[PDB]
Amino acid sequence: DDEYTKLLHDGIQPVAAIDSNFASFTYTPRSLPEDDTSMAILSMLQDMNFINNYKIDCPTLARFCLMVKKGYRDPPYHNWMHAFSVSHFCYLLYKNLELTNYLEDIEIFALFISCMCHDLDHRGTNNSFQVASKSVLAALYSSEGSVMERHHFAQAIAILNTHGCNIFDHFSRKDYQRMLDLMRDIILATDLAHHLRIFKDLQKMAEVGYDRNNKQHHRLLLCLLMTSCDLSDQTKGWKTTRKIAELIYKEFFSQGDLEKAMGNRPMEMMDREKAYIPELQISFMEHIAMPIYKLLQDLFPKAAELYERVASNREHWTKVSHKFTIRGLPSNNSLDFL
Ligand SMILES: CC(C)Cn1c(=O)n(C)c(=O)c2nc[nH]c21
Ligand SMILES: [Mg+2]
Ligand SMILES: [Zn+2]
């Protein structure tokens, strides 16, 4: 409540005061201290003109931002700093790519709020684990698929439906229904099985050319953009790539350990006794990340540097892999580890 009081009564800090490089593809939002991130979200919403444009109520918006923040747990990767960094990449796409030539204002606003909300209440395990472990979330949503994503979305809606937090409640019935439908489509798009299912449709869009009058093209493009935000850690420097891999694998291997403990054999990527990080990272980059940024470049020539960073981070894993083989003796001069 004291954070609220300051967020409401102090004023929204100019977005340029956050960092000289804040609106650049090269800025690493993970550099921002966590206690500074809710005010940075208000600064970005202001700079995108959404607060004025949609006449969002200030007290309601401050409550909503804090509630969203408080709705993340602290697994190594799927925490509020990941949501905050995804949301920042949305802001980057807006500042560096002329989205307004492709998407409706309301679409762009929904993509940004969906980025804030898209992993709410994640417990550091994936859809497969929900099913295998017979979790309450699979009881609710296993028949439809995308279990966690449905739960993120439901969590977002629960926040809006909390007294004092409905940032859309003055909207017309038509616009409110549109915003919530968009949030559903965008947050369900973050299931990488969904991205893989629509991949051919994305390629076909890129090849024939984006048609702004085509409602299906809008929908495909929001999916690609949301994916591109959710994987944007791979578009920074090598120090970020390396640190994100440490967090992702800590989280995956915790899951693998639970799976072992219930008698299931984990995916190789989830088993700490089998996973070979360089090879796993290179596969993720070649098979998932680079094709996404290449499609982004195809649609938006000014996105080319993102695809180039991902390709360079990929080359970097090949360059360091040799270090994963123990040459000589360990530092302690001991083979006790054997
Ligand atoms: C978090 C996970 C579902 C997807 N994912 C990811 O987003 N990044 C950035 C990776 O490097 C990665 N490696 C495997 N999965 C990965
Ligand atoms: Mg997710
Ligand atoms: Zn995410």
UniProtKB/Swiss-Prot annotation:
Expression across tissues: Widely expressed. Expressed in brain, with high expression observed in the corpus striatum. Also expressed in heart, placenta, lung, skeletal muscle, kidney and pancreas.
Listed result of changing residue 241 to Y: Loss of 3',5'-cyclic-AMP phosphodiesterase activity. Loss of 3',5'-cyclic-GMP phosphodiesterase activity
Biological processes, Gene Ontology terms: adenylate cyclase-inhibiting G protein-coupled receptor signaling pathway; aorta development; cAMP-mediated signaling; cellular response to 2,3,7,8-tetrachlorodibenzodioxine; cellular response to cAMP; cellular response to cGMP; cellular response to granulocyte macrophage colony-stimulating factor stimulus; cellular response to macrophage colony-stimulating factor stimulus
Effect of residue 234 to I: No effect on 3',5'-cyclic-AMP phosphodiesterase activity. Decreased 3',5'-cyclic-GMP phosphodiesterase activity
Binding site for Mg(2+): 119
Top-level taxon in the UniProt lineage: Eukaryota
Impact after mutating residue 329 to A: Decreased 3',5'-cyclic-AMP phosphodiesterase activity. Loss of 3',5'-cyclic-GMP phosphodiesterase activity
Residue pairs linked by disulfide bridges in the UniProt entry: none
Catalytic residue list: 78
Record annotation: effect of changing residue 280 to M: Decreased 3',5'-cyclic-AMP phosphodiesterase activity. Decreased 3',5'-cyclic-GMP phosphodiesterase activity
Keyword Cell membrane in record: yes
Keywords, comma-separated and alphabetical: cAMP, Cell membrane, cGMP, cGMP-binding, Cytoplasm, Disease variant, Hydrolase, Intellectual disability, Lipoprotein, Membrane, Metal-binding, Mitochondrion, Mitochondrion inner membrane, Mitochondrion outer membrane, Myristate, Nucleotide-binding, Palmitate, Repeat, Zinc
Impact when changing residue 248 to V: Decreased 3',5'-cyclic-AMP phosphodiesterase activity. Increased 3',5'-cyclic-GMP phosphodiesterase activity
Keyword Metal-binding: yes
Variant or mutagenesis effect after changing residue 269 to L: Decreased 3',5'-cyclic-AMP phosphodiesterase activity. Loss of 3',5'-cyclic-GMP phosphodiesterase activity
GO MF term list: 3',5'-cGMP-stimulated cyclic-nucleotide phosphodiesterase activity; 3',5'-cyclic-AMP phosphodiesterase activity; 3',5'-cyclic-GMP phosphodiesterase activity; cAMP binding; cGMP binding; identical protein binding; magnesium ion binding; phosphate ion binding
PDEase domain location: 1-324
Amino-acid positions noted as binding Zn(2+) in the UniProt annotation, renumbered to this chain: 82, 118-119, 230
GO cellular component entries: cytoplasm; cytosol; endoplasmic reticulum; Golgi apparatus; mitochondrial inner membrane; mitochondrial matrix; mitochondrial outer membrane; nucleus
Function: cGMP-activated cyclic nucleotide phosphodiesterase with a dual-specificity for the second messengers cAMP and cGMP, which are key regulators of many important physiological processes. Has a higher efficiency with cGMP compared to cAMP. Plays a role in cell growth and migration.
Record-stated family: Belongs to the cyclic nucleotide phosphodiesterase family. PDE2 subfamily.
Domains as described in the record: The GAF 1 domain functions as a dimerization domain.
Subunit annotation: Homodimer.
The name this protein goes by in its record: cGMP-dependent 3',5'-cyclic phosphodiesterase
Organism in which the protein naturally occurs: Homo sapiens
Gene name of the record: PDE2A
